[PDB]
């Protein structure tokens, strides 16, 4: 018994014989569409920046108890970010942190380490500021969250209040053996449940650099458009 093949014909006419309750305050606000398509090239991790936030369990000691008599005004928006930083400000220098939460390394010998550390090369925009002269306004994108027009630099959270951040960052690693509040995966395995330089590429420092000089004035035709309101 066989099956059909190409080239044949077909006869057409002739004589044949209950909804979850909490998303309304969670999403409002509108998105702007263009009239055309979108090119998007920013990572979702730095859209999060840090993937670290801290729940009620320790911040019930501080957000409604320490803000009562704090000289510098103490919010929550300044605090949750700074204690998310330094895990990656030190990640270059203890990959044998793995085996013991007794081997947490203290701030008295983190003094030359974490004060001049650089978070995934953190500070790239301030030396990018001097040729850009965003010196009056404050370095904000929408890829950036809006929590940086309000928050404050890394110094005068440490050098006004730094002796009480690591503190309850310490005791809650031993109960999980040093893992994060979100243990990353089952990533101990991908498992189950439970000569080219010398010819043509030297324009790679010419054909992306031919607009870096333009890039100092890709801002300037909008960097001129700011000082007018006030």
């Amino acid at each position: 018994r066989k099956i059909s093949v190409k080239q044949h014909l077909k006869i057409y006419l002739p004589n044949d014989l209950m909804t979850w309750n909490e998303y309304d305050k969670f999403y409002t606000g509108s998105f702007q569409e263009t009239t055309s398509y979108i090119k998007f090239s920013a990572t979702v991790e730095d859209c999060c920046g840090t993937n670290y936030n801290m729940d009620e369990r320790d911040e019930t000691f501080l957000n409604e108890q320490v803000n009562k008599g704090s000289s510098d005004i103490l919010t929550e928006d300044e605090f949750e970010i700074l204690c998310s930083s330094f895990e990656h400000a030190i990640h270059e220098r203890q990959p044998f942190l793995s085996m013991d939460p007794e081997s947490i390394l203290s701030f008295e010998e983190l003094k030359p380490t974490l004060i001049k550390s650089d978070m995934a090369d953190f500070n790239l925009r301030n030396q990018l500021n001097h040729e850009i002269n965003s010196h009056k306004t404050h370095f904000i994108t929408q890829f950036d969250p809006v929590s940086q027009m309000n928050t404050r630099p890394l110094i005068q959270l440490i050098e006004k209040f730094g002796s009480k951040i690591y503190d309850y960052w310490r005791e809650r690693k031993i109960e999980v053996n040093g893992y994060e509040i979100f243990p990353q995966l089952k990533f101990e395995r991908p498992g189950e449940k439970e000569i080219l330089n010398s010819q043509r590429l030297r324009a790679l420092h010419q054909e992306l650099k031919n607009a870096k000089d333009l890039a100092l004035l890709v801002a300037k035709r909008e960097n001129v458009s700011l000082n007018w309101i006030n």
Binding site: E207, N210, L214, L217, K220, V224, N227, W228
Partner: peptide, 23 residues
């Protein structure tokens, strides 16, 4: 009081159009 870097910069692009990406 404020139009100084605004008028002395805009001959660069027609100095740029036949500079690099015309060839």
């Amino acid at each position: 009081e404020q139009e100084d870097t605004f008028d002395n910069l805009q001959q660069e692009i027609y100095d740029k159009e036949t500079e690099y990406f015309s060839h």
